Amino acid sequence: PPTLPFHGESAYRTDYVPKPLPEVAKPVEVKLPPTLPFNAQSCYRSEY
Amino acid sequence: MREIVHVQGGQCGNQIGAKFWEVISDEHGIDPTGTYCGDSDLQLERINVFYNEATGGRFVPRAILMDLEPGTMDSVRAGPFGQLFRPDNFVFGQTGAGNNWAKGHYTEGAELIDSVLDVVRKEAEGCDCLQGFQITHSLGGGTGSGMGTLLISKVREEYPDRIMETFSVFPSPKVSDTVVEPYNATLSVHQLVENADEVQVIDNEALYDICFRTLKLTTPTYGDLNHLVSAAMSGVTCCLRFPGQLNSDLRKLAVNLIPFPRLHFFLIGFAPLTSRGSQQYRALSVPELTQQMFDAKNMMCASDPRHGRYLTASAMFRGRMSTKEVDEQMLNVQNKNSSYFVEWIPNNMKSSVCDIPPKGLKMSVTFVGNSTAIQEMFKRVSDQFTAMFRRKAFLHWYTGEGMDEMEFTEAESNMNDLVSEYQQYQ
Numbered sequence A: 001p002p003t004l005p006f007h008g009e010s011a012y013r014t015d016y017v018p019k020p021l022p023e024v025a026k027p028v029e030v031k032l033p034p035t036l037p038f039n040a041q042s043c044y045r046s047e048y
Numbered sequence B: 001m002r003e004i005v006h007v008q009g010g011q012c013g014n015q016i017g018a019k020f021w022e023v024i025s026d027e028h029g030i031d032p033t034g035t036y037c038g039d040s041d042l043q044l045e046r047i048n049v050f051y052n053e054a055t056g057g058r059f060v061p062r063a064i065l066m067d068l069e070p071g072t073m074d075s076v077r078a079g080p081f082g083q084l085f086r087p088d089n090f091v092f093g094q095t096g097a098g099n100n101w102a103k104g105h106y107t108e109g110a111e112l113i114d115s116v117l118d119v120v121r122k123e124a125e126g127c128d129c130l131q132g133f134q135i136t137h138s139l140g141g142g143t144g145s146g147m148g149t150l151l152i153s154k155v156r157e158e159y160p161d162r163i164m165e166t167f168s169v170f171p172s173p174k175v176s177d178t179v180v181e182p183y184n185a186t187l188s189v190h191q192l193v194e195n196a197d198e199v200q201v202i203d204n205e206a207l208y209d210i211c212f213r214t215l216k217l218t219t220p221t222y223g224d225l226n227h228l229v230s231a232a233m234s235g236v237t238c239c240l241r242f243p244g245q246l247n248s249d250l251r252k253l254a255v256n257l258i259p260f261p262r263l264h265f266f267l268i269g270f271a272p273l274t275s276r277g278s279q280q281y282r283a284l285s286v287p288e289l290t291q292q293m294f295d296a297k298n299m300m301c302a303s304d305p306r307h308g309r310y311l312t313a314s315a316m317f318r319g320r321m322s323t324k325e326v327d328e329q330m331l332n333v334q335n336k337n338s339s340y341f342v343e344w345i346p347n348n349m350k351s352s353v354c355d356i357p358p359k360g361l362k363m364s365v366t367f368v369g370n371s372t373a374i375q376e377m378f379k380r381v382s383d384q385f386t387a388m389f390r391r392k393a394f395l396h397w398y399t400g401e402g403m404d405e406m407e408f409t410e411a412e413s414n415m416n417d418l419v420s421e422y423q424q425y426q
């Protein structure tokens, strides 16, 4: 009599295979608005 | 001279005060580093009202940031203009007061608050006088209102003459998250009325109404909302900070707005405000400023003043301007609009003039107003409170740590008689 080969994979090893890791290196670069020049005078200095 | 100690409580208070220290620093010419970057004595001479000095410059804010969850203060630190605060001016806290007034006021807050008044005390008698305390916090939240309003009573009993000026975000009922907003707000207003001097009701919902209708912001984020409030927060402390023809401190505001001992819930509106492409079209004269700050769309509190009167109002102007163009506008709103202004008080408005405008804008207005229309949400949060409290809503997480049921009925009773006190003058 012959001997059939064994085809068998358990479900944990079929669908929990080591997956490729996601590719994450994305910083959120934020600018800074430049500070406006200070246009403001005192009234005492403005007329006196 | 004069000194302000700024304490921020909770996630809302820390994120709304961080933008405040961004807009004050822009006004005083201070980098995220903390060095001056201009040539202006006026921009630097009244700096002790919000900044201390440490050896080689390094103008550190007088900020007492404090929270029971280490999630939002670190976000302030990592952001720009966030290294200005001292590492020991950060009262941390593990676990957390998860949306419970009691977890900030009876347990989990009483242990931390000993260290909080230490940091307050070093930044209180570190100078010569003290005008008062600026306290940004949140009524609609646990760690914000719990140790927030507790601190209000602690620094009142330690300094019972300083101005207790508090910016609070009241929970507006219509479109807002977290379900325990009625229980936090009603319990916190009770502590807020005999312990605070100038409570400024600044709702998130009405700030959204400013963003959608006035500014027409397509996607108003939470930084957009805090930018508006930080602008009003700079406009009220202007005369402690900059010269002017007619000056007005915070103690000016409390005397000339509060007729009777409680009566201290004001409405703010700040207005060089303009649409998206409307900077090329708006004028910036006083009459359009006055016509804008009295518009009900320009309230930070959705407590519509046409559904009420103006008990006493105030407008602290800023920028270069003439005194009569202030005066005739402050008189024309009284003569033309007479129904929404109370009669037993004459001349129901003060005005002040800062000669230093905000950065870029030639002229600006802030409008703090003691109006007898704030009781609309003193009824709104009370109806939300009693609808829950009748058939025994979320209370086992408010009882097992120490409060009894009588504190809830007394908190609603003080809410109710303050509603009746505002309805007295109507």
Ligand SMILES: Nc1nc2c(ncn2[C@@H]2O[C@H](COP(=O)(O)OP(=O)(O)O)[C@@H](O)[C@H]2O)c(=O)[nH]1
Pocket: B009, B010, B011, B012, B013, B015, B016, B099, B138, B140, B141, B142, B143, B144, B145, B169, B176, B177, B178, B204, B222, B225, B226
């Ligand atoms: N103005 C402002 N309001 C906020 C901010 N974050 C949350 N809120 C509001 O506050 C409510 C939640 O408060 P919460 O953060 O839980 O307070 P806390 O956790 O006790 O400090 C929500 O309804 C929000 O609308 C903020 O950064 N700025």
